[PDB]
Amino acid sequence: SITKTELDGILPLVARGKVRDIYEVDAGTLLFVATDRISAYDVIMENSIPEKGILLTKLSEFWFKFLSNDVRNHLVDIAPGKTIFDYLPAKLSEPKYKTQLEDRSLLVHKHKLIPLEVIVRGYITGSAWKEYVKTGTVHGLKQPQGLKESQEFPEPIFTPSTKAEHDENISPAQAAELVGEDLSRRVAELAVKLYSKCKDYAKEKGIIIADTKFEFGIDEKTNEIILVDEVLTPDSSRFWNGASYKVGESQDSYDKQFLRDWLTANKLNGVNGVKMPQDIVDRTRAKYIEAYETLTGSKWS
Numbered sequence: 001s002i003t004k005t006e007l008d009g010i011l012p013l014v015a016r017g018k019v020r021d022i023y024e025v026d027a028g029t030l031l032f033v034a035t036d037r038i039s040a041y042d043v044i045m046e047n048s049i050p051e052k053g054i055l056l057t058k059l060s061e062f063w064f065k066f067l068s069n070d071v072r073n074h075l076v077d078i079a080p081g082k083t084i085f086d087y088l089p090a091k092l093s094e095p096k097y098k099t100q101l102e103d104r105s106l107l108v109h110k111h112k113l114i115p116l117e118v119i120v121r122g123y124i125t126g127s128a129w130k131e132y133v134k135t136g137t138v139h140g141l142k143q144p145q146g147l148k149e150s151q152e153f154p155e156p157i158f159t160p161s162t163k164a165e166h167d168e169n170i171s172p173a174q175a176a177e178l179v180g181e182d183l184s185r186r187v188a189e190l191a192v193k194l195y196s197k198c199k200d201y202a203k204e205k206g207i208i209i210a211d212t213k214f215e216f217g218i219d220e221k222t223n224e225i226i227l228v229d230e231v232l233t234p235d236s237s238r239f240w241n242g243a244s245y246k247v248g249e250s251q252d253s254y255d256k257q258f259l260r261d262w263l264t265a266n267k268l269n270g271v272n273g274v275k276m277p278q279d280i281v282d283r284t285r286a287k288y289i290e291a292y293e294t295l296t297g298s299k300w301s
């Protein structure tokens with residue numbers, strides 16, 4: 001696994017997130033490296049999921065391409081026949097570095113981010129289900145009565161969260177407080193549009209995208225929302241098998257929920273330094289790969 005990139009100062013480190021190591025290529029561009037780290041409940045596991053970051057990268061790329069006519073994205077154009085390494089200092093092609101970067105790195109434009117987790121829910125689960133059972137709303141929004149667990153909403157819904165300790169689910173109205181009324185509506189509508197397109201596509205492939213978290217940037221020069229971060233990965237989404245889908249209960253996970261649930265079941269949610277047993281590593285990895293393969297129609301290996 002590539003757990004922590006070690007680039008020996010060749011590029012400045014902008015950040016490490018839970019998953020990504022982000023370096024500055026230049027003033028406008030980031031080397032956006034998805035490591036193999038995995039986190040749940042905002043805590044990184046001790047051990048990694050080998051090549052998860054490659055999957056997140058590749059799957060993101062798939063979706064960026066799928067959505068390329070629907071939304072601008074943060075990817076830097078790589079000229080034909082070139083690789084990201086052509087756009088990096090030569091030293092990063094040396095194997096010590098290249099092995100840490102290849103297939104898990106995106107060269108992206110630094111964007112001003114819209115400070116929301118742009119969650120779209122097509123189906124009620126997770127935190128939405130928890131809230132709905134209580135008060136019949138999601139992120140404060142009113143809903144039809146009688147939804148059962150995992151049921152499809154009548155229409156997918158934008159249900160933002162803050163970008164945090166833990167992210168906070170907020171209403172669209174509160175999101176508009178944060179980001180502006182016009183922008184928030186644009187975000188909502190675009191997110192739902194993107195989600196729905198992907199949902200429909202995925203459904204035909206056999207996957208229900210229950211929900212997903214997008215991240216958007218804003219290019220204030222062109223007044224364009226930019227799809228940034230990762231897109232429709234099993235970290236950012238819940239993927240259910242359509243054929244096994246059954247409302248009124250939880251679904252099999254093809255996504256991080258498997259790990260989340262395992263941690264919770266084992267009273268390890270929130271605990272740092274958790275070593276996923278190999279079985280859990282493997283099962284998680286395999287679930288992610290299954291999602292990847294089904295969604296993309298391509299083989300992982």
Ligand SMILES: Nc1ncnc2c1ncn2[C@@H]1O[C@H](COP(=O)(O)OP(=O)(O)O)[C@@H](O)[C@H]1O
Nearest residue numbers: 016017018019020074108109110111215228229
């Ligand atoms: N194009 C971009 N420009 C700047 N920051 C970005 C861009 N795309 C994503 N990001 C940010 O890069 C980080 C990605 O790393 P990640 O490990 O996913 O972080 P997190 O732990 O917050 O989820 C996040 O802070 C994300 O918002």
Ligand SMILES: Nc1ncnc2c1ncn2[C@@H]1O[C@H](COP(=O)(O)OP(=O)(O)O)[C@@H](O)[C@H]1O
Nearest residue numbers: 018039040041042043161164165166167256260
């Ligand atoms: N214990 C918690 N209580 C409330 N919200 C949480 C909790 N843990 C994580 N979250 C939030 O749920 C979302 C998903 O987190 P999760 O994927 O499970 O951990 P990570 O975000 O590091 O991968 C994030 O917005 C995160 O901030």
Ligand SMILES: Nc1ncnc2c1ncn2[C@@H]1O[C@H](COP(=O)(O)O)[C@@H](O)[C@H]1O
Nearest residue numbers: 075076077078082083084105106107108
């Ligand atoms: N912004 C980018 N960062 C890293 N790799 C990229 C980027 N854009 C394209 N690629 C890679 O270049 C190759 C051609 O991709 P594409 O032409 O976008 O289908 C693929 O292997 C991509 O992974």
Ligand SMILES: NC(=O)c1ncn([C@@H]2O[C@H](COP(=O)(O)O)[C@@H](O)[C@H]2O)c1N
Nearest residue numbers: 117126127128211212213235236237238
């Ligand atoms: N901060 C995050 O990475 C994040 N925040 C939300 N999500 C995704 O948003 C969806 C809704 O999550 P929840 O039901 O826990 O609010 C799930 O697919 C979840 O993985 C994320 N990936």
Ligand SMILES: [Mg+2]
Nearest residue numbers: 017018019229
């Ligand atoms: Mg992230």
